[PDB]
Amino acid sequence: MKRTWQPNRRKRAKTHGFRARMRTPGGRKVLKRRRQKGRWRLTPAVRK
Amino acid sequence: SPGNCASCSNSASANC
Amino acid sequence: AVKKFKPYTPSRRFMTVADFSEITKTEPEKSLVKPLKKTGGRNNQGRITVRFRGGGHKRLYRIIDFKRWDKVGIPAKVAAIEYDPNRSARIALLHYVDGEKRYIIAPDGLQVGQQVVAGPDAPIQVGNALPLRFIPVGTVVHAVELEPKKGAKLARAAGTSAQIQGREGDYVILRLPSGELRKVHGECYATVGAVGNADHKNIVLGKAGRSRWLGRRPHVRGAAMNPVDHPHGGGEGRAPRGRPPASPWGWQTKGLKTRKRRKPSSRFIIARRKK
RNA sequence: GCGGGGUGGAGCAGCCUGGUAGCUCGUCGGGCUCAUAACCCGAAGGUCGUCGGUUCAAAUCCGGCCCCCGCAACCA
RNA sequence: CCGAGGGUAGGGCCCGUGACUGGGGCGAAGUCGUAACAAGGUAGCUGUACCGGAAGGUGCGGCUGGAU
RNA sequence: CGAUGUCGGCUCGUCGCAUCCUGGGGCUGAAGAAGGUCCCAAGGGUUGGGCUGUUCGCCCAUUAAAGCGGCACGCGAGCUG
RNA sequence: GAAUGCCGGCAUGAGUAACGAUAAAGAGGGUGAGAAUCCCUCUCGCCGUAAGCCCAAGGGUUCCUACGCAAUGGUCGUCAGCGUAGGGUUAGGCGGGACCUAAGGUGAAGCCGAAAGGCGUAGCCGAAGGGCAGCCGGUUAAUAUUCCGGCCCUUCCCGCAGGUGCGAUGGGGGGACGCUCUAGGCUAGGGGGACCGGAGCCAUGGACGAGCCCGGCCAGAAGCGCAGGGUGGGAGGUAGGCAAAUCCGCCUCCCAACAAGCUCUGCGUGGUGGGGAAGCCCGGGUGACAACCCCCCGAAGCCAGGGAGCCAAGAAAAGCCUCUAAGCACAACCUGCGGGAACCCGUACCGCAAACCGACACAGGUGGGCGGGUGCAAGAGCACUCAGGCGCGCGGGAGAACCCUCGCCAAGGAACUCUGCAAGUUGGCCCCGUAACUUCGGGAGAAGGGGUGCUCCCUGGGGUGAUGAGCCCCGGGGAGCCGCAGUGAACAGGCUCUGGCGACUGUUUACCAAAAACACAGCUCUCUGCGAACUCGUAAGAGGAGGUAUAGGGAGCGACGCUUGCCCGGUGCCGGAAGGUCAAGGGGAGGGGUGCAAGCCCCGAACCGAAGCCCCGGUGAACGGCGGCCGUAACUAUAACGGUCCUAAGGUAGCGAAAUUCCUUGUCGGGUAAGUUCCGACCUGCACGAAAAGCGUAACGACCGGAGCGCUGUCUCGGCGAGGGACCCGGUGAAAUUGAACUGGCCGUGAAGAUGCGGCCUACCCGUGGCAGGACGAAAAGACCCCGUGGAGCUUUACUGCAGCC
RNA sequence: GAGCUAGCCCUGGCCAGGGUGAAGCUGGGGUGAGACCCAGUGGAGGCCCGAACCGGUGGGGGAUGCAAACCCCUCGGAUGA
RNA sequence: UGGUUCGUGGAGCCAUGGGGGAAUCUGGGCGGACCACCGCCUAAGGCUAAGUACUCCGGGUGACCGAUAGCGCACCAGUAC
């Protein structure tokens, strides 16, 4: 049947993207944490 | 059926 | 006069539609329409704040002239009478000798081709607008401003009217459509005559789909829900109220008055509504 | 299994707070009426379901027995 | 080919009968009240409506076939 | 109770005998025929249907007879539900 | 050494289940160390409103070629979406950006919030909507509306000519809109041709034929033609379109109107440029100087902003046009022509799937367009088939039980069973014909029947064309022919009678319930006078509503019909300027501490003092509630009648053993041979009853009862047959489970149901196919139940707070 | 976190074919004029049959599945809520 | 109302949301209700090293670990998945 992952490049970038994160306090703490942990990608990659 | 929810042993398939 | 249908479907049995007899023009004035932002009952938070709304026909809002003292002395001609889906009354298209075009809501008996005019010196004639103080006692009247220059607020729905009962200083006494006796300032404008389309209230929607067309989504009874949802929720099988009948939010809903007690306008309401 | 009840012929007070049994109907005698009913004047009839106990004294307070309605009997 | 009639299917009319049920007629001495005939003790009758164990009552309007 | 699946039906049997029938008997208030009652006997047999989830029961039509119980109220790693 | 311990390794089950749609294969020839599996050829089968083709998303080199086969591939592999390497994606016109706006988002002004932040007008952002200029063919191993060829077109810059009051983010027009139905004329697409072009063919009994087989087009600027869309002209006045205005709007006047004119699309033609089959020969070459013509069918597409009707009344903004303001009229704009200029991103490939979403090369899921032919009434249905694409990545044998899917069946025909569950039957079209009841529509495809193919003959009407021929479309009558059978295959209702519930079409527990549940039009009560009530929010601010009592909120009831009784004592709500109580505050009789004292400090009675509560009334489609005992009639029985106790008042109409009746399979009647169910009645209703509505009700229902007809493998009662498995051989090779095991029966014993203890009995060692009685077999630390001063949802006149309101 | 699901908002798209035949309109009849009746035309509808599409009624299979909800047969809606 | 040991307590002190509201030394605060006496201190403006905390970073040292240990990572790890 219809499963839950329905990839959408615009939806992915507008929801989890770099600029969505920086817009809100909780979003910046995500980037701050993932930098501190040393994450290679701070944000999901999506072709655009 | 055991199955549905009144009993609970010997009697129906996987769910848990 | 409502139009009936023969029982050729279960719903056509009872469905009645307006006759649309008075309508003379079937497309709006392009310069007087703007898009109506459908809300679905959602506020700026995105939250439903009026339940059971959404999904009705698309509509264009027709700009209405509710302050007719805007153009005192300038007569206009009644050029057409049109359907407005944003209200129960019909609206009237006016061609002022100015060349300005405006919509008023159409009173009962207004004939296309006649002249209307607004102002202190106007004839007491169906469709004219005067400050309340200059209209004779006894005249039934509509589109009544509630405070001077603030715009027509009272008696606008199909078939409604207020009747002037008397005068008292700078104020006239109106009997509103609800039967309330209120004091309204004499400087307030009002339009002589009742609102047209009185047969409006005799329409039988006839089926569920017709409520859907109007933007009315199905209403679900509190008795049909669970206690997490409503005071009347739950019970094993059917169940009487089991408590004073209540809204979803707890407050009682049979008789409990809700007008603010210390409201400044209480000084101006003479007698609360009837019936 | 728990609850209430049993008193003139009928239906009920009094029992809680021990000493005194009362109300309406009915029944009996006499009036009024041609007569009956209605109405009016009088009167009679109950040892309080039963046995046992407490008490100076028990319809009344406490036990047993008989009886009469009433409520309950759920989870499997 | 038609064709007595047989067969299948669906209708219409009549008759008889049916748990139960509706009122009706009649029946020497049942029970309740007293509606009507006198102004019958609330004048009667009346079409309708509503109500009530029962006769009846009451409303609205009508008739005199109503007394004084 | 870190699970011994719970009524009935179906299927498949198997055992007991306090025996429903069939075989053998004594007593009879056993004339005959047909019963009654008790004893011996478990080899085999013990129908089809209407109602009800029913077990049971009632009823219809038959029958030599239409037995009663046990096997985790026999039998859901055999089915049904 | 144990923690259903943790991590790892390796066992058992086991050469076992399985190898993923039952669309299907066979041979020959190649390649190679090796071939059922790769390549080629022939034969066979499968899809063909797809299982073909083209877009979009998502994926991200998977594309092409060479060389490879360790792993991946459910087997194999020489092959591959796999490994290595090289190559491949070309645009002014396609798509998106350098254009516009929609929801929404953001947000100079402004508002609000302890902080973080929340709002917010304009503006900005935001598309699969508006707007905007490219069609056909060729070419590569791999891209092409992109390269090339042909023929067209757009914008920007500059210049020349001609014309004009030029000029805008400002004004106006326009853009600009629904649903259903639909005209005329076209095009896409298709069928036929005895006409035109073509390599050939004559078989096996016949045919050298008006034979068979193949093809008979595509694009195109100006002009022209056909068909449509859009559009009146002039003048005078003018106070409105937030400046101006010659524009637009409004008034008047003359002319023009189902026209015409002008303008804009579509289609046709059109200079020109392309394409071009079968068959043969090795993707190519030929055919070929290929021919390229006539008739018919014909769109849902085009003309288009077409027409009519209806109510539920159907975006915006820019481009474009017009008007003017600053400004400037050496300018500028418009029109024609010429030269020049024209950027960024995407383009490979898969795309109903082996490349996307599902851990898998997974029988599932995924939006748009094209989707040929014949026949069946039509069609995208069904059968077969074209183009094109596939045989589904284990095979070979065998011919058991048993399982799955399928076919048939003597006699019977529901006897099966909880239940006709399942499976039969019926089945399309045309014609005849059709009942109760009904809200007059319906019920209705009621029911039930007859017809159905082919051949010959006669003939009625339509379309195109011409009025005729031809083609095509609807029919009518007569005479015949064959079979068991004519919708001859495939697709395609079993029916009736009678109850319960719900009026109806709808909605629901994604993944055990589709219903009688929810919703529903309709009915009633109640709140709300507008800065409404109510709702979300600390607020600002929103929704309500750019609505205004014929409106909006809340509540119950649930089409419709006939109806909806009695109780206001308690709770709720409503009304009540009195009285009672009442907090902070006022008041300050009178006390107290301290100081030499002035004073400073503390307690404090009467009395005044809101809402709330008390109290007085109202109120049921507000919460709710609507009796008991005893007696009585000229047979009996039963009580119209009476007595008395109690209540706020004692259940009315209607209905009743019911979706409610315990006793109960009540009793009686109907249906049956037989009826715990069903239907009709009765009424001692354990425990119906009137908007948690009462009693009905045509129509409707994948709802739940009962009965009958039809027909059957459901059954008596089973039999045979088909295929996919199961079985055997080759290849690959799991799983839960598992203290170890050298693991029998009886009768006992044992923590009470023993392979494991006792006594006896039985038994050579090891497997394979089968069946499920035991291993208190497996699975899941029992959901039931209890316990825990364990948890959570929910309720209220439990406690205590808080929001909110007074 | 609303790329699943639920509602709403904005903007697009889709629904073969066949049947039934409301209003209106026209003509005719009728009447003082009417209502009304008849025929034709018309093409309404949470109308009817049935693909796509959306569902998920009954049964069977599947149950270490093809699948952590699937397959087959059957069945509901299919211009509308 | 908060702070303090102080939970309304005999409840001062410090701070302050609301109301009322002075004085400039003969002024004002404090010494745990209050009063007297006796003392202490000068509110309603601001700044100020050092001694104190921490360990991303560098170094020294361990009756610290020694690849299931020691950081999650001795190794291309906040990676693969």
Ligand SMILES: [Mg+2]
């Ligand atoms: Mg889903």
Ligand SMILES: [Mg+2]
């Ligand atoms: Mg996932």
Ligand SMILES: [Mg+2]
């Ligand atoms: Mg999606």
Ligand SMILES: [Mg+2]
């Ligand atoms: Mg996207």
Ligand SMILES: [Mg+2]
């Ligand atoms: Mg997108």
Ligand SMILES: [Mg+2]
């Ligand atoms: Mg998106």
Ligand SMILES: [Mg+2]
């Ligand atoms: Mg976001």
Ligand SMILES: [Mg+2]
């Ligand atoms: Mg973003």
Ligand SMILES: [Mg+2]
């Ligand atoms: Mg922050």
Ligand SMILES: [Mg+2]
């Ligand atoms: Mg990095």
Ligand SMILES: [Mg+2]
């Ligand atoms: Mg992130």
Ligand SMILES: [Mg+2]
């Ligand atoms: Mg389980």
Ligand SMILES: [Mg+2]
């Ligand atoms: Mg109607």
Ligand SMILES: [Mg+2]
């Ligand atoms: Mg009608």
Ligand SMILES: [Mg+2]
């Ligand atoms: Mg109908």
Ligand SMILES: [Mg+2]
């Ligand atoms: Mg009208």
